[PDB]
Design a binder for this molecule. Structure first.
Ligand code: ADP
Ligand code: ADP
Lengths: 125, 125
């Protein structure tokens, strides 16, 4: 039962990198990157999303054999929470909001994950 | 531009040479499909199935940028046929039967695909 850290990533559009790396180093945790394709060809979108997720993950200094990639479809908050439950995650690491939006001190997904996760949550600023 | 559909049962080698050779003819896209039959979470089963599908595909000498992965849920023959139609496939490549079963010279999925597919079908022995 290695530690498992869930790292949701919005692939649309760096402070989380040092935090994920440091948290992973604590236990040599498994690091599960997740991207959610919002609802409303699917196999093609999933494939392109996985490729972009992997591109982003190259920025992180984590061993290859510790990184796992997930693509979900639907509500980002619902899927982040579902995966934190099913892994189960020992930690969720999430940015407080998108870097280019300051109106809200916590974004919606961050606020929901912080409140509803069954595990600890690190909100990164 | 050419598209080859290769259904794989992730429960249970001869098709490898044929797929590699057929793919070389045009530099075809190769679409691997596995169908998980109907009755823990569906999301985790889909991801677990895709992971095993990808491990099998590592046995095939085909360029990375030509391989595509699909997971469907239900009747294998119905989903094989649905994808062959919608891609649309120029070829389906299918083993005559499961390697370990000799009583049916042609398995039931192979028989339905070779009769109902709208494209050419290669039955491999
Ligand atoms: N589509 C998505 N897939 C995966 N994670 C996401 C997605 N959207 C948001 N998140 C997670 O939530 C974090 C904050 O996003 P959010 O709470 O929606 O605020 P904002 O709307 O400012 O981006 C993101 O940094 C990301 O970790
Ligand atoms: N669940 C499945 N998903 C994708 N392809 C399948 C599945 N089951 C069978 N096939 C395809 O059909 C081929 C032959 O299977 P089938 O006709 O069921 O014969 P058998 O009954 O001996 O397994 C398999 O090698 C595979 O290519």
């Amino acid at each position: 039962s290695n530690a498992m850290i869930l790292v949701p990533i919005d692939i649309s559009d760096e402070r989380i990198i040092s935090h994920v790396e440091s948290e992973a180093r604590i236990d040599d945790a498994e690091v599960h990157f997740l991207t959610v394709i919002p609802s409303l060809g699917m196999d093609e979108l999933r494939e392109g999303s996985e490729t972009q997720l992997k591109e982003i993950a190259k920025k992180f200094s984590i061993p290859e054999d510790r990184m796992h990639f997930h693509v979900a479809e639907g509500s980002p908050k619902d899927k982040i929470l579902a995966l934190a439950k099913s892994l189960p995650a020992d930690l969720v690491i999430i940015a407080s909001h998108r870097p280019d939006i300051t109106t809200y001190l916590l974004g919606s997904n961050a606020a929901a994950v912080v409140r509803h996760a069954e595990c600890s949550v690190l909100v990164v600023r």
